[PDB]
Amino acid sequence: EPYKVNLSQDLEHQLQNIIQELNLEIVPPPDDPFMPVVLNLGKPSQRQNQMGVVPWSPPQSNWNPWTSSNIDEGPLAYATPEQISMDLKNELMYQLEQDHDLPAILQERELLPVKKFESEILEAISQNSVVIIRGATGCGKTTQVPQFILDDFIQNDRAAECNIVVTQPRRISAVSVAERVAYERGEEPGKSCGYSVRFESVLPRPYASIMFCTVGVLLRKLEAGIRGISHVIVDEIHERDINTDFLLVVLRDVVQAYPEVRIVLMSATIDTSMFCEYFFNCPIIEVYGRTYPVQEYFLEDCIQMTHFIPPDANCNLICGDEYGPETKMSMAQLNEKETPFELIEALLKYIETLNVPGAVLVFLPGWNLIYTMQKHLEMNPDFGSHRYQILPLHSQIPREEQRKVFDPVPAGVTKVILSTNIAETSITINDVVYVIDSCKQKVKLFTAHNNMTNYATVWASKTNLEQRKGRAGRVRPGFCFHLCSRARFERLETHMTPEMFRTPLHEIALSIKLLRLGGIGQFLAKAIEPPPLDAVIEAEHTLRELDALDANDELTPLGRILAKLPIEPRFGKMMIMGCIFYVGDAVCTISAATCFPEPFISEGKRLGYIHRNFAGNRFSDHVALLSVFQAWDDARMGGEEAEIRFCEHKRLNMATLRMTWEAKVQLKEILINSGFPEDCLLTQVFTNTGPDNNLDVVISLLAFGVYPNVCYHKEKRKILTTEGRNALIHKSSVNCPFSSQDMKYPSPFFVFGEKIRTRAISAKGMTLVTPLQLLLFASKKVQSDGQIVLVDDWIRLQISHEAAACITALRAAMEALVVEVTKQPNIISQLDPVNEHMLNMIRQISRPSAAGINLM
Ligand SMILES: Nc1ncnc2c1ncn2[C@@H]1O[C@H](COP(=O)(O)OP(=O)(O)O)[C@@H](O)[C@H]1O
Numbered sequence: 001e002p003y004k005v006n007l008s009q010d011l012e013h014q015l016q017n018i019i020q021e022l023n024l025e026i027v028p029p030p031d032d033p034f035m036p037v038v039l040n041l042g043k044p045s046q047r048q049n050q051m052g053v054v055p056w057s058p059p060q061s062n063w064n065p066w067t068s069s070n071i072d073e074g075p076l077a078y079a080t081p082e083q084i085s086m087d088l089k090n091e092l093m094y095q096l097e098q099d100h101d102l103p104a105i106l107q108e109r110e111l112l113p114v115k116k117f118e119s120e121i122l123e124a125i126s127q128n129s130v131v132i133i134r135g136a137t138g139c140g141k142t143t144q145v146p147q148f149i150l151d152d153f154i155q156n157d158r159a160a161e162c163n164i165v166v167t168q169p170r171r172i173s174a175v176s177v178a179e180r181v182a183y184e185r186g187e188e189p190g191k192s193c194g195y196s197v198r199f200e201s202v203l204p205r206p207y208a209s210i211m212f213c214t215v216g217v218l219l220r221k222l223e224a225g226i227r228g229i230s231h232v233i234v235d236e237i238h239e240r241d242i243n244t245d246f247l248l249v250v251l252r253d254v255v256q257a258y259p260e261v262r263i264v265l266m267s268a269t270i271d272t273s274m275f276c277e278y279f280f281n282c283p284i285i286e287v288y289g290r291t292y293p294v295q296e297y298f299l300e301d302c303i304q305m306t307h308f309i310p311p312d313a314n315c316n317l318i319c320g321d322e323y324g325p326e327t328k329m330s331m332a333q334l335n336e337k338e339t340p341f342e343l344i345e346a347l348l349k350y351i352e353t354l355n356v357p358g359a360v361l362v363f364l365p366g367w368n369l370i371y372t373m374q375k376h377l378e379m380n381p382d383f384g385s386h387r388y389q390i391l392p393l394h395s396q397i398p399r400e401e402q403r404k405v406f407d408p409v410p411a412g413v414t415k416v417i418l419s420t421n422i423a424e425t426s427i428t429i430n431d432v433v434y435v436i437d438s439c440k441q442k443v444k445l446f447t448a449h450n451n452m453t454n455y456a457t458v459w460a461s462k463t464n465l466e467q468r469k470g471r472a473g474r475v476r477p478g479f480c481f482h483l484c485s486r487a488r489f490e491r492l493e494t495h496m497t498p499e500m501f502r503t504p505l506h507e508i509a510l511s512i513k514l515l516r517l518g519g520i521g522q523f524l525a526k527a528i529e530p531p532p533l534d535a536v537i538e539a540e541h542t543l544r545e546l547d548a549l550d551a552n553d554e555l556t557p558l559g560r561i562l563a564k565l566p567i568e569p570r571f572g573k574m575m576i577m578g579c580i581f582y583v584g585d586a587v588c589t590i591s592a593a594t595c596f597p598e599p600f601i602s603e604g605k606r607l608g609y610i611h612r613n614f615a616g617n618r619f620s621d622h623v624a625l626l627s628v629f630q631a632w633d634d635a636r637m638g639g640e641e642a643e644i645r646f647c648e649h650k651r652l653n654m655a656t657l658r659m660t661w662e663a664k665v666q667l668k669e670i671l672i673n674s675g676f677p678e679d680c681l682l683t684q685v686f687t688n689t690g691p692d693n694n695l696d697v698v699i700s701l702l703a704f705g706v707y708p709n710v711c712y713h714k715e716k717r718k719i720l721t722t723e724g725r726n727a728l729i730h731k732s733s734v735n736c737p738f739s740s741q742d743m744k745y746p747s748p749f750f751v752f753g754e755k756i757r758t759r760a761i762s763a764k765g766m767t768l769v770t771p772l773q774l775l776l777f778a779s780k781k782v783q784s785d786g787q788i789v790l791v792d793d794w795i796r797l798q799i800s801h802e803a804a805a806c807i808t809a810l811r812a813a814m815e816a817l818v819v820e821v822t823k824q825p826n827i828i829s830q831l832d833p834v835n836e837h838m839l840n841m842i843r844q845i846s847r848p849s850a851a852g853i854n855l856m
C-alpha cells in the first residue's frame, strides 16, 4: 500500500520557489494517469590514457621513502653514503656488546628451518630480479627473510643501499610481525622496523630499514612512485588477496622497465606455477623443516569415539557401512549449515583420554562463533580455570591478548585456541598437537548488482583442510578433527575461488586511474587471473554513476578525492557533501566507524538498556554510535583513568573509540589537504532528543552513503528488502524489539548498514529516515502518475507530484554543486546566494517536522 505523506502547503510553496530560482523545469504531471512519467533528470571531458608504468628508483640520501619527502636536517641529510654505512655497522656491534639478552634470542632465530637456506636465498635474490620462496608455514620466511637481506647489506657496508617494503594481506599481520621483527633485533618498532596499516603507522628510519605495510596502504602511496626502495617482499601470495593480485600486475610492469629492482614472493606449499610463469619463469627456493605426519578424522569418526548424541544434498545422511548403527543414526540428526558446539565440547575432553600433552587449535568462522563457544566452555563445569586455558584469536581483540597464544602454559593444563583462519598460514603456534576443523570459511559474498557486502559462512577447500591439518604435527605426531562428513569432503572444491573473481573492483579501478596505468578493463586483463567481465562493467558503471569518472572513463576531480580517501567511494562522496553543509566532522565520524567493529560490549543475546539510551528518539544505530562518541570525547578530557572509567561504566570498548577517532582525524586531514577549509570540519555539539538541523542533514547524507540498503517495517521483527523479499532486524540493533514485543516507529523507512547470512537473512545497523530523505538521497529511479509515486519500483508513495519532482531536482542541483566544489573545494566559503538557498531548502526537507513527524 502507499504511505500517507502529509506536507505543509507553504513548504510545497518553497520547493517550487527554489526550483524556479535555479532556472530548472519540473517534469509535468501525466495527462493520462497511467503514463508513468519519471522524475529523474541528469547533469568538461578529458583526453584518454595509454598503458603506463609506476616509476622506480633505489634508496637516496636526502629522501625519506616512508614519508615520501626530503630531509634537510640531521645526520643523514648532510652525510655521504659510506659515512652512514660505516656508522650503522658500528652501532650494531656496539649493541652486540652492551645488550646481554640480544644473543640469547639470535640463537633462537637460527633454530628456525629457514635459517639453513639463508645462503641460497640471498644468492638467488642477488642474481635474479624476481624470486619465489616457497616453503611450509612455520619455517619463518616472514620474520627472517627480510632480516637476512638487511643484515647482509649492513655488514658489506651497503647499509644505505637497502630499503625493504614487506606487504601483508591482513592489518594484524603487518603490525604484529613488525613488533616481532623489532624485538628479534633488540629494538621497539621505530628503529629499523616500522609498519603502516590503514589509519595507523610507526615509521622506521630513512635508511637500512624494513617497512611492514598492507597492500592498500602501499597502493595509495604509489602516486609518488616506488622511490627509494631496494627490495619489495610480497608475503602470503597463496591467500590470493585481491589487492595482492592487483599489486603483482603493477610490480610485473616494474621489473620489466626497471630490472635492477628486487622482488620476493613468499608462499606456503601450493602450486606456484602461475606465479613463476607470470614472472618470466623466476627461480623457486624451496624451504622445509623436520615435520611429523597426522592422522586426520572426519565427522563419522568424531561421533564414533565419543558416543555423541545431539537433539544441496545433506552429506550427513550418507555414511560408511563399517561404521556402526548408532554412528549413522546420530550424525544424520545434525545439519551441516551450523557447526556443532556440543560435539566439539565433548571432543575436547576425549583428548584428555589420549594423555599426551599439548595445545588444541580450533578453527571456526568469525567472532560470533568464537565468543559463543568460549562462553560455552568457560561458564560450564569440568572446564575449570586451572584445568583448561581457552584463548580466542579473532584479530579483533587486544594485541596483548593475541600474544598469549604463543607463550607456554603451566604443566598439567590444556591450551585451547579458538581462532580464525589467521592461524591457517598467517601465524604459527608452538604447542599445537591437536586441531579441530570447522571445515568452513567466512567470506564477503558480493556479486554484480548485489550492492550489499554480505558476510556468509561457506565450505572450505580441500587445500584448506590440508593446510589446517599441518598446524598439528609441528611438535610430535598429531591429530586433526574435521567436522565434515566423508561424503561432504568429496563434494568440496580443490582450491577456493580467488577474491579477484568475486569482489567489487571499483576501489581497484580508482587506483588504476589515479596511478595512470591505462584503462580499467585493459589493465585487469593483464592479471595473473583476470576478473569476470560483468564485475569490470559494474565497477565502471558504478564510478561513472557518481561522477568519479566521466563517460570517457577518465578520472574527474571528484574521483581523485575519492581515490585519496581510504574508504568506500560512496562514503567518500558523502563526506564531501557533509563538508559543504559544514557537518564534515560528524559525517567523517560515521565513515570512520564503518571500518571498525561496533564499540558496544554486548554480553550476548541482544543489546542492553543503557546502550539503547544512546540512540535517543531518532531510532538510529548510527546516532547511538555518534552519541557515544560525543560522550566519550567529552569524558576523555578528564584523563587516561577518566576515559577508561567512562568506558568501563557504560560497557564500551575503549580501543575501538580511539581507533575510530584517529581514523576520523586522518580522513579530516585528506579533505583539508584537498583544499576544504577548517571551519566546515569543526566539532559541532548536537542533541539526540530535541531538534538538531546539523543532525537532520547528517541523517540525510547517511541515506545517500548507505544507498541502496533500504527497507520497510511491517510486523514486529519483519522487514522487506528493496527487491521485496522478507528480512529481519538484527538482535544487536537498537530498533530491534525484545522477545515477543513490538514498538511503533514515527516512520517505517530505514536505511540500514549491513546484512548477515548464516542462519537466515537480517539487517544490521539501522537508521530511520523520512519520506523526503528517501526521495532526496535514498532512491535513484522514481516514477509519478500525478498523485501516486513509485520509488525504485518496489516502494509506493502517495504524495504531491510537483513536490516529489522538485526534490529529485535539488539532488541533481546538489550533484552539480558537488562537481563545482570538487574543482575548487575552497568554494564552499564564498557560495553564491542561489547555491546557499539550495542548501537551506535541503536542510529544511531533512527535518521530520516538514514531513509531518515529531519524535516526542
Ligand atoms: N610474536 C611471536 N612470538 C613468538 N614466536 C613467534 C612470534 N611470531 C612468530 N613466531 C615464531 O616464529 C616462527 C616463524 O614465524 P613466521 O616468520 O611467521 O613463519 P612463516 O611466515 O614462514 O610461516 C614460528 O615457529 C613461530 O612460532
Ligand SMILES: [Mg+2]
Binding pocket: 141, 142, 235, 236, 425, 426
Ligand atoms: Mg608468513
